[PDB]
Design an enzyme around this catalytic site. Structure first.
Site, PDB file in Angstrom:
ATOM      1  CG  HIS A  25      -3.741   0.330  -4.170  1.00 22.66           C
ATOM      2  ND1 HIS A  25      -3.976   1.451  -3.396  1.00 22.66           N
ATOM      3  CD2 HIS A  25      -3.360  -0.654  -3.313  1.00 22.66           C
ATOM      4  CE1 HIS A  25      -3.706   1.164  -2.133  1.00 22.66           C
ATOM      5  NE2 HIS A  25      -3.324  -0.110  -2.057  1.00 22.66           N
ATOM      6  CG  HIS A  74      -1.833  -1.208   1.243  1.00 24.06           C
ATOM      7  ND1 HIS A  74      -2.838  -1.463   0.332  1.00 24.06           N
ATOM      8  CD2 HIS A  74      -1.750  -2.308   2.026  1.00 24.06           C
ATOM      9  CE1 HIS A  74      -3.373  -2.639   0.581  1.00 24.06           C
ATOM     10  NE2 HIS A  74      -2.730  -3.172   1.611  1.00 24.06           N
ATOM     11  CB  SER A  85      -6.786  -0.336  -1.466  1.00 19.15           C
ATOM     12  OG  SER A  85      -7.131   0.840  -0.829  1.00 19.15           O
ATOM     13  CB  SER A 140      -3.877  -6.275   0.197  1.00 19.64           C
ATOM     14  OG  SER A 140      -4.644  -5.629   1.160  1.00 19.64           O
ATOM     15  NE  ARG A 186      -1.679 -16.038   2.099  1.00 23.30           N
ATOM     16  CZ  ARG A 186      -2.112 -17.272   2.400  1.00 23.30           C
ATOM     17  NH1 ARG A 186      -3.344 -17.666   2.066  1.00 23.30           N
ATOM     18  NH2 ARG A 186      -1.311 -18.124   3.030  1.00 23.30           N
ATOM     19  NE  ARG A 187      -6.860 -10.259   9.167  1.00 23.46           N
ATOM     20  CZ  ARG A 187      -7.451  -9.328   9.914  1.00 23.46           C
ATOM     21  NH1 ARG A 187      -8.771  -9.184   9.868  1.00 23.46           N
ATOM     22  NH2 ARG A 187      -6.727  -8.558  10.723  1.00 23.46           N
TER      23      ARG A 187
END
Ligand SMILES: O=C(O)c1ccc(NC(=O)c2cccc(CC3CCCCC3)n2)c(Nc2cccc(OC(F)(F)F)c2)c1
Ligand SMILES: O=C(O)c1ccc(NC(=O)c2cccc(CC3CCCCC3)n2)c(Nc2cccc(OC(F)(F)F)c2)c1
Length: 193
Positions: A131, A43, A113, A111, A139-140
């Protein structure tokens, strides 16, 4: 030129005070995303390495396919994969294709956003998504990202993606010529030294 694919985690306001992961259903009404979003690292501004090639709701989640296109990033990563004992330490010994393994191990998370869900429950003014980041941590729900040299080979690796869903993911890679994507802004944080 690489492809990346995987199911994402949806994060609102990432890595800031108000960070919060979103149920995919909080944003599925705003899918699919057919236009390129930047792919960055963790990010961070100015770590664009590529562009998304489609974000889709499928049975098991939100799947992202992307293109890693940055010449500075590919050259650096690949040099590391061939000469850095540190980069290779957590990877299996003597891999074929060390760059793919290095990326798969050090940046396993995708990920996505998004704006805060208080905006998403109503009707958002502007773009819901900003993005996708390649992430070292956090990470999940996402799968371990797959990197490869051809988009069909990548999407093929996830068993929870059906043949029709895969046939609803490859049309859009092949719908965008990689050559026509913008040049991403990643700069090697090495010679900043
Ligand atoms: O300022 C410094 O001196 C500085 C020092 C270290 C940094 N990185 C990490 O600590 C770090 C940790 C975990 C994963 C990664 C991604 C790498 C993993 C190895 C193979 C390719 C990609 N980086 C960064 N940050 C950084 C930003 C984006 C990409 C990046 O990797 C590379 F430079 F190799 F592209 C590093 C900066
Ligand atoms: O020139 C060489 O031959 C050279 C070769 C390899 C290097 N590092 C890695 O393979 C590597 C891989 C994953 C994480 C880190 C960060 C660690 C180690 C560096 C200091 C921060 C803690 N480094 C570096 N060192 C280095 C400096 C700053 C950023 C950087 O990129 C990145 F961390 F992303 F790999 C590497 C240099």
């Amino acid at each position: 030129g690489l492809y990346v694919g995987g199911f994402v985690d949806v994060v609102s306001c990432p890595k800031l005070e108000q960070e919060l992961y979103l149920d995919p259903d909080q944003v599925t009404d705003y899918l699919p995303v057919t236009e390129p979003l930047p792919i960055t690292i963790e990010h961070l501004p100015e770590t664009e390495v590529g562009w998304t090639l489609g974000l889709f709701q499928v049975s098991h989640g939100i799947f992202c396919t992307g293109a890693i296109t940055s010449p500075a990033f590919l050259e650096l990563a690949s040099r590391l994969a061939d000469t850095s004992h540190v980069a290779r330490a957590p990877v299996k010994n003597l891999p074929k294709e060390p760059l793919l393994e290095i990326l798969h191990t050090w940046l396993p998370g995708l990920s996505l956003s998004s704006i805060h869900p208080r905006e998403l429950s109503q009707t958002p003014s502007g773009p819901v998504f900003q993005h996708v980041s390649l992430c070292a941590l956090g990470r999940r729900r996402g799968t371990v990202a797959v990197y490869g040299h051809d988009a069909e080979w990548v999407v093929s690796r996830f068993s929870s993606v059906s043949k029709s869903e895969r046939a609803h993911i490859l049309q859009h890679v092949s719908s965008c010529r990689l050559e026509d994507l913008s040049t991403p802004n990643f700069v090697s944080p090495l010679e900043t030294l």
